[PDB]
Symmetry: D2
Subunit: 214 residues, 4 copies
């Protein structure tokens, strides 16, 4: 059962620009307020040679405030749960694929995550670590072949002001039948609360609220 | 000077799938409430053989409610005014280019518009007229090389429920120096209020509100 | 009837970055050797403020050497003839749409052409005129919904060596039924033979040879 | 040293549509004739629930016939060797990322490969196994930030004739300084010679020839 306070555990294995890494995270959140925080620790591949920000949005749409009038694809899916797949296409040709298989055991969400990144330019903001944060965003959610897709126009703020664009397309797949939502939106804001020098340690917060637009 | 009630006049010349057309419109709006309505009349190329909806978002971001804390690129640009260029990339490979050069004379906005569409599949929703409306959207606005870009994940609702995606990228260019806004959003909803059988006559409404996200 | 020497006449009307222009061309070619040359003259909008090279590949696949074993979509279509539509998507977000409606009258191909370009960055190679030529290419031709598509990975050579990529997708539509070709290729090389300082006058050559690959 | 007959060993680990798998291959080739063959055996994740063809072009551009006038980026890189990264963007939104780190030991090329695929539609040709083969192709090779990129318009032939497009962008990175080639092409043909019912066993051939175009 999904309570008002829930715990998060995760392990991400991945490779960006040939660099292998493993990251583990523990935290907690409030599913009905659409908030969560976690602490993340690089287990292998430190120091990461790329912008930590490309990972952060991979680190669960259960953590979203859903109003009564929009069916909540994520909450309805448990105890069985759900998985997602995502591509991230950056404007200079960097591409990431990502996935998360989310299970519930007691009061804790377990997150098995793969992340893979290719074709980032050597002098781009990713490989030179010139990103500051992701701007807030609005994810456009709709049903396509019986599952939920979310598309997002994401943007990283860069050093010197200036933006670097990435398009997300995520497919969310419930492991049981649930009532499918009509087209709707989820506003997102995501923030690195703290970190140490090489991002070996990172405290990371998210707020998500689902809505119907104007 | 931009007053609380302003008038709209326009002429669009274009070609979609080889089909030439001319459309003229007259209407009015409230720039500070971010609302406008117009009546449109096909002058040449009737009956249009494609979904009228691909044109509608081409039929002025002056008509947007801007809160005090976000510089209003569009209003600041007058009396001199501004122009925009847009590409629309549809998910089945249909591409449109569009432009509007906007002038102010008295209480009336004049809009000189070109629209061009290519590579729509013969059995796609556009050429078969299977679109119902554009979902509301949120445009992500940011400065790039000293002018304003807006990117949007747009979606047409189709007959049978089901969606058809299009990505908009618009470059907005003021004809004088204005104070540039930080990254921000504009929510949009657009609606065909009425039309006759072949869309020779169309009454078209828009609401736009600029904001800073979560 | 399509003879071994044929003549070319054309008029292109278009707008790039807001700049309106008209170009007319006359030349000639050898349809069965897959060669053609033309002289082009800017009629309106001189001096063009963008790289002339973005137009050149818009200035007829009749001019292609087709071996016996691949049906020749272009030649088979006359006397009735054919039209095409093209999008050109550049790697920095510049997009062009283009079209040509091709008629035969006597020994002369008439070409009615529209060209429209948007969202070229102010300091990009297009607006700064930093292009040198298009590399040769290979167009991948295939049938899709009963008409012929060609896709191409095009690249402009830039000043300083260095390349600027553009993807072409063209839909070719015969005005009668013809025997449809299986997947095949057309190699292309295109060359500005001469021009005057502001490209008001341009001599332009093309060679095209269709083939079946390795 | 790269001799006229060379051996191939490889291991691919990957996940497509959530399905984990491991494949190992052994074979051999002629680097200067640009030919190679290998036998592949699914070690984990049998039976694969997706079209084996999406993997095949991931299963070394050392195996390419390079004429004297084009510097051979791949051969020049050994004994040190090289790695590549690739994205594959399919026309219905399926995306794969891939990589290969290639080492030389004695007469044998070792290939450490990761493959990851997301967002393939449930009724698309990939998940329904409706692919027949990759058409031959031509890869456009050019230098970008001091390393070699190859772009390709790939197409799978489908059951019922009909094609399914994928764009490849690969970054090839030599592990020492080599003489960089000018823009050039590599023609490719790739063929499943034999396989058993569930593609647990696959015999796979490639021919690659580098050239300068028309």
């Amino acid at each position: 059962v999904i309570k008002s306070d829930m715990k998060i555990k995760l392990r991400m294995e991945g490779t960006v620009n040939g660099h292998k890494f493993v990251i583990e995270g523990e935290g907690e959140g409030k599913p009905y307020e659409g908030t969560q925080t976690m602490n993340l620790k690089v287990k292998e591949g430190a120091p990461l040679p790329f912008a930590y920000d490309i990972l952060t949005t991979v680190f669960n749409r259960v953590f979203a405030k859903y109003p009564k009038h929009i069916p909540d694809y994520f909450k309805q899916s448990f105890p069985e749960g759900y998985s997602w797949e995502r591509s991230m296409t950056f404007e200079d040709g960097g591409i990431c694929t990502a996935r998360n298989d989310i299970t519930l055991e007691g009061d804790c969400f377990f997150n098995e995550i793969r992340f893979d990144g290719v074709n980032f330019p050597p002098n781009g903001p990713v490989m030179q670590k010139k990103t500051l944060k992701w701007e807030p965003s609005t994810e456009k959610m709709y049903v396509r072949d019986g599952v939920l897709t979310g598309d997002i126009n994401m943007a990283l703020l860069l050093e010197g002001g200036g933006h670097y664009r990435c398009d997300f397309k995520t497919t969310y797949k419930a492991k049981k039948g649930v009532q499918l939502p009509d087209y709707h939106f989820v506003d997102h804001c995501i923030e690195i609360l703290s970190h140490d020098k090489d991002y070996n340690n990172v405290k990371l917060y998210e707020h998500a609220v689902a809505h119907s637009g104007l």
